[PDB]
Each structure stands twice: as structure tokens, then as C-alpha cells.
Amino acid sequence: KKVIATKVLGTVKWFNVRNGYGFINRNDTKEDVFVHQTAIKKNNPYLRSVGDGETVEFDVVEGEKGAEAANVTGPG
RNA sequence: CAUC
């Protein structure tokens, strides 16, 4: 719920569609942030997914277990 | 739903 950072750019380390989660490495701090599939904004063209090695833009928010990505989109 |  609580927003820590906005408009953060990062690269997807991995995302596993079976388990429905992954990690994004923040460009700004170089730390991994957890991303759940629900946190990813709906695709134009696995409606909620990101691809390994892709650059994405997201908010960082406070989850139960730590920092997690929110509102994950393409850059811009 | 936390290193698959």
C-alpha cells in the first residue's frame, strides 16, 4: 500500500509464469525487487507478464514481506 | 506471492 518510490526503471531478472512471480533489478539502486503477476499492468499484445531482460517502469511499495513492484509497465 |  505505501508508496516508496515512483517511476523507477529496472530490468526483469526473471519472471516465472507458472509461479506467477519474479524479480526486477532496480536501475537506480541495483537491488532486486519482488514482482507478483497482479502488479503488472494489462498487456496490449499471459495478460499479466513481463519478460526476462526487459526494461520496465514501476512503483516501489511496501508489501508484507518487503519492497515490491507496483504498476509495472513499459518504460514511458 | 520472495530466487523459480
Side-chain angles (χ1 to χ4, degrees), chain A residues 29-43 45-59:
Chain A
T29 66
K30 309 309 185 204
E31 294 281 319
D32 289 347
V33 297
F34 179 82
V35 55
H36 194 255
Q37 63 193 349
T38 59
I40 303 164
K41 286 227 201 145
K42 297 182 318 189
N43 294 14
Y46 302 107
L47 177 63
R48 295 166 195 269
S49 64
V50 294
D52 298 5
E54 118 171 273
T55 293
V56 292
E57 183 178 2
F58 53 102
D59 308 328

Side-chain angles (χ1 to χ4, degrees), chain A residues 6-21:
Chain A
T6 68
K7 289 171 70 180
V8 185
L9 293 165
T11 310
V12 176
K13 188 189 167 174
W14 55 267
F15 183 84
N16 186 305
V17 303
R18 174 174 192 156
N19 299 324
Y21 80 95

